[PDB]
Amino acid sequence: KGEELFTGVVPILVELDGDVNGHKFSVSGEGEGDATYGKLTLKFICTTGKLPVPWPTLVTTLVQCFARYPDHMKQHDFFKSAMPEGYVQERTIFFKDDGNYKTRAEVKFEGDTLVNRIELKGIDFKEDGNILGHKLEYNYISDNVYITADKQKNGIKANFKIRHNIEDGGVQLADHYQQNTPIGDGPVLLPDNHYLSTQSALSKDPNEKRDHMVLLEFVTAAGIT
C-alpha cells in the first residue's frame, strides 16, 4: 500500500538542525524523487550561514524510500511499506580517527510531500582534522547500504562504510550504523538481507551565493537473485 505513493514524481523537503563540537547550523533542502528510476534531485542550503562541516559528510544524513526495488525484490522494501505514516531513521557515523555524528530523523508524508526532518549531534571532532578542517573533496560518493531485518523493533538495521576522498589523496572513512523503525502500527515488510547501491553526485548552482549543495543521486536495491 505504501508503494502506491511512489509510482510517480514526489516532492521532497528536508530540514536538518545540527550541532558539531558546538557549531550550530541548519540546512533546508528541496527536490523530488522518482523511485521508478531510483532517482533523487535535491538542492540543500545552509540557512545559518557557512556550514561548519563538509557538505559531503552530510549527504547520507540528508530518503531511502526512493530506492528502486527490482520487481522481484519488492517484498523487501521496508521503507515504502512504512508510508505514509513513516519511519524513524537513526544513525551513528564514526569518522575514523576523529569524531562521530549521531542522527535521528523522521521520514513521512505531509500531504503529497515526502519530508525528512533530522537532528544531528557531532562530538569529539579534531579542530584540525579532515572534518572541521574541511579537507574532504566535493565530488562523488558511491557505496552499498547493507540491510538486515530487526524483528524486535519491527524494522531494519543497516551498516555501511563511506570512503571520503581527502584533498591530499588519502581517505577519511565514515562507518555508518543505522536503524529504522516504523512510526505507525501497521504491517511492514521485514526484508531478507540485501543492499542499496547508491551513487551521489555533488555539484554547485552557479547562480547560488549561499553555502549549498546540489545532489543527483541514484539508489537501487540489489543482492537478491
Side-chain angles (χ1 to χ4, degrees):
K1 200 157 160 46
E3 168 158 47
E4 299 163 20
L5 298 171
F6 294 91
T7 53
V9 178
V10 174
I12 300 169
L13 299 171
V14 184
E15 294 292 326
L16 178 151
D17 286 336
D19 179 327
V20 174
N21 277 41
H23 301 279
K24 297 183 175 163
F25 60 99
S26 297
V27 171
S28 295
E30 300 183 16
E32 61 185 33
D34 195 351
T36 302
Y37 305 99
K39 183 179 187 179
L40 289 163
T41 56
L42 292 159
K43 178 177 169 190
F44 303 95
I45 296 161
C46 180
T47 60
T48 49
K50 270 199 201 64
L51 196 67
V53 295
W55 280 107
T57 70
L58 299 183
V59 168
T60 62
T61 296
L62 292 164
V63 291
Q64 293 171 323
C65 49
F66 289 99
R68 186 181 67 83
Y69 276 75
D71 177 78
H72 76 276
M73 295 181 62
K74 277 189 185 313
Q75 67 267 43
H76 304 289
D77 187 351
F78 165 82
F79 310 97
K80 294 184 191 57
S81 82
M83 295 298 161
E85 274 150 290
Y87 52 79
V88 177
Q89 177 159 301
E90 288 170 276
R91 301 211 180 92
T92 306
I93 307 171
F94 293 98
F95 292 90
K96 177 169 177 70
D97 299 312
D98 211 331
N100 64 85
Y101 296 162
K102 288 188 182 67
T103 66
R104 188 180 187 282
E106 295 186 9
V107 185
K108 67 179 75 170
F109 280 86
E110 296 290 354
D112 291 332
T113 303
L114 189 284
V115 178
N116 183 23
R117 287 180 184 95
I118 316 146
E119 52 188 348
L120 174 152
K121 181 73 166 169
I123 68 175
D124 292 337
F125 288 90
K126 295 169 178 175
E127 288 196 317
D128 65 329
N130 296 315
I131 295 83
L132 293 175
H134 293 270
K135 308 186 189 188
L136 301 187
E137 296 182 348
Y138 185 92
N139 39 44
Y140 187 78
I141 308 174
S142 175
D143 226 292
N144 292 332
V145 177
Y146 297 98
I147 292 170
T148 191
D150 188 357
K151 283 210 162 66
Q152 284 222 216
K153 283 168 193 166
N154 200 39
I156 57 169
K157 293 184 199 298
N159 76 262
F160 56 102
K161 300 178 94 84
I162 299 301
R163 286 153 269 258
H164 293 288
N165 301 134
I166 300 166
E167 62 186 14
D168 69 10
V171 186
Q172 175 62 73
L173 179 59
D175 280 289
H176 288 62
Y177 296 83
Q178 181 176 330
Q179 70 189 11
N180 298 61
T181 53
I183 291 167
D185 200 34
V188 294
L189 299 174
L190 301 182
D192 287 344
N193 288 3
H194 65 287
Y195 63 94
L196 307 180
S197 177
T198 310
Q199 300 80 50
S200 302
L202 293 58
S203 62
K204 295 296 187 184
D205 179 347
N207 297 313
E208 179 60 70
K209 292 295 174 308
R210 296 170 288 181
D211 199 358
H212 71 286
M213 170 174 70
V214 176
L215 175 65
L216 172 67
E217 185 167 291
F218 294 91
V219 189
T220 311
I224 301 184
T225 177

